[PDB]
RNA sequence: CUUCACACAUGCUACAAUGGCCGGUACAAAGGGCUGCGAUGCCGCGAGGUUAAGCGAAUCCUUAAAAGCCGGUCUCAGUUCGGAUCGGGGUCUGCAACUCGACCCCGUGAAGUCGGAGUCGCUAGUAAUCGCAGAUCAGCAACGCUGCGGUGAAUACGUUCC
């Protein structure tokens, strides 16, 4: 039983229909999937993102990612079709309000000059997306066994209808706004 | 396929150097993470020319 | 050893070692050395967890390290240009600001020879 | 005069044009041939006419530029390039 | 007279381990000084500030010579090599340091890993390296010039060739 879920519906939960006016508890927004992926670009050359991107977000989240391929061939960029470039991983139930609570109280914090996240990073539903700076950060991977540094982008969708819906939700979760 | 392909996620215990700690599962063998900045340890968590001239004089 | 975000190099001398953060040189490292009792002479591999606390914290007391020191290195070289004073019009252009002599030398504001 | 013990050094005949001009409370443009003075914080919202060789340069000291002598504000030499 | 798409010339500091840094400790010569030289004492991390002894000088000040020596550390790295550029804060002289001074402290840490065709000096206290002093001078762009001593080499068969 992770403490962020049991957290979420003891308080959490109930402060929400104080903020907004809800008529019925089936309403009440809730994060679904946190969806992470590196988008690993520089694999169209040297084929090596199964030793350097797949066992770092194995260890990361928790589970081993999909290695997501391209859908159409472009020239500038030195690629084709069906040509491995990003690797992705989905986090549900119960490992999603693990790595919740593991992100905002341990990880981070560790950002090289932290300053907070930006509440304008809405997708206009209520979807939040920042992102990181390299295989820092977590401690699961550590700096010293690791090939290149490369960074991520973290989705969070919720089952909020609009933008500040899914402000005063994360706000009470830990994430740290400005 | 949720069998023997997926690492090592079993419970683990987190402290910090200010005192604060929990526990959640992580991948981190022997369930031994020691973090040195927490949630509650780190700023920001918790928090002209003119006036150079008259400092001088 | 993550210090402030810099993450010292590991069999390295803690006089020396210090320097590599972005706002600490040779003097300053001796008073960081002096006022929280830890040698000169130690290697950072046997840098306890206990004295690693001691000087988190006497630089953030007294010190003015990276992130805000280097926005205040950029942002000082940015008074200058938009209150067009002498310096500020010799920064965006490339050329020394110190009274320096531009006849023959300065290939370090500039680049390498251009040979026309 | 660049030393923390004699203070600051602004020309006698451009201090007597702004005590003139600061209790009686107008903007006239002061012309000056003084480029060597410091500007100082009774110079905010005046203009200045600073000669810098040729011809006479405006100058509206702001906020930003109170430490400053007042002739690094009239460039002396005119380039535009060797093409 | 100090500009700057560039080009040549004379130098200086480097590219390191026959070295860098830190601590201790020996050895000079020739010069300069009343609109001056500031011993000592206190203050300042330092440039220097202040007090003022002595002295027109084989008397007093300049005056701590540096390489060298002894010990400790760094262990071949664009570095504890290199100190360019730039940010902040200062001292001094001078009516005045913006154009356009030198010095100091802190932070910053660029090129450079011994240099293509070509080319330069030197035959002995010489070259190579290390300091110190003077002249002009309020101060100084002094790495220049004129001097001074310390440590101290390698080769010259020979006149074929330039
Ligand atoms: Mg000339
Ligand atoms: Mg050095
Ligand atoms: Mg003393
Ligand atoms: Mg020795
Ligand atoms: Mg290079
Ligand atoms: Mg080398
Ligand atoms: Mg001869
Ligand atoms: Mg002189
Ligand atoms: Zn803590």
């Excluded at chain 2, 150097?17 to 700023?43: A, D, L, M, Y």
């Amino acid at each position: 039983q992770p403490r962020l879920k049991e957290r979420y519906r003891s308080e959490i939960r109930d402060a929400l229909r104080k903020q907004f006016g809800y008529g019925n508890v089936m309403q009440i927004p809730t994060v679904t999937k946190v969806v992470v992926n590196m988008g690993v670009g520089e694999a169209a050359r040297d084929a090596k993102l199964i030793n350097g991107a797949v066992n770092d977000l194995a260890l990361i989240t928790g589970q081993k990612p999909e290695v997501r391929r391209a859908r159409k061939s472009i020239a500038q960029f030195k690629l084709r079709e069906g040509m491995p470039v990003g690797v992705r991983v989905t986090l549900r139930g119960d490992r999603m309000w693990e790595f919740l609570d593991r992100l905002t109280s341990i990880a981070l914090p560790r950002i090289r000059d932290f300053r907070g996240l930006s509440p304008k990073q809405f997708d206009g539903v209520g979807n939040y997306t920042f992102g990181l700076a390299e295989q820092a950060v977590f401690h699961e991977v550590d700096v010293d066994k690791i090939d290149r540094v490369r960074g991520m982008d973290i989705n969070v969708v919720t089952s909020a209808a609009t933008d500040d819906e899914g402000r005063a939700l994360l706000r009470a979760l830990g994430f740290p706004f400005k | 396929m949720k069998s023997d392909i997926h690492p090592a996620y079993e419970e683990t215990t987190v402290v910090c150097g200010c005192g604060n700690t929990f526990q959640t599962r992580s991948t981190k063998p022997g369930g031994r993470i020691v973090v040195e900045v927490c949630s509650q340890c780190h700023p920001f968590y918790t928090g002209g020319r003119v006036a150079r001239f008259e400092k001088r004089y | 050893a993550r210090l402030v975000g810099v993450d010292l190099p590991r069999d390295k001398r803690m006089e020396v070692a210090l320097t590599y953060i972005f706002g600490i040189g040779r003097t300053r490292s001796n008073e960081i050395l002096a006022a929280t009792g830890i040698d000169r002479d130690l290697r950072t591999r046997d840098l306890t967890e206990e004295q690693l606390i001691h000087l988190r914290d006497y630089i953030e007391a007294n010190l003015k390290v990276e992130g805000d020191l280097r926005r205040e290195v950029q942002a000082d070289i940015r008074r200058k240009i938009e209150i067009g004073c002498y310096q500020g019009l010799r920064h965006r252009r490339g050329m020394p600001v110190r009274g320096q002599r531009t006849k023959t030398n300065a290939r370090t504001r500039k680049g390498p020879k251009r040979t026309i | 005069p660049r030393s923390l013990k004699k203070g600051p050094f602004v020309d006698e005949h451009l201090l007597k044009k702004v005590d003139v001009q600061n209790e009686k409370n107008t903007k006239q443009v002061i012309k000056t041939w003084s480029r060597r003075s410091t500007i100082i914080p009774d110079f905010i919202g005046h203009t200045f006419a600073v000669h810098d060789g040729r011809k006479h340069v405006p100058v509206f000291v702001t906020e930003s530029m109170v430490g400053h002598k007042l002739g690094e504000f009239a460039p002396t030499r005119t380039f535009k390039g060797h093409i």
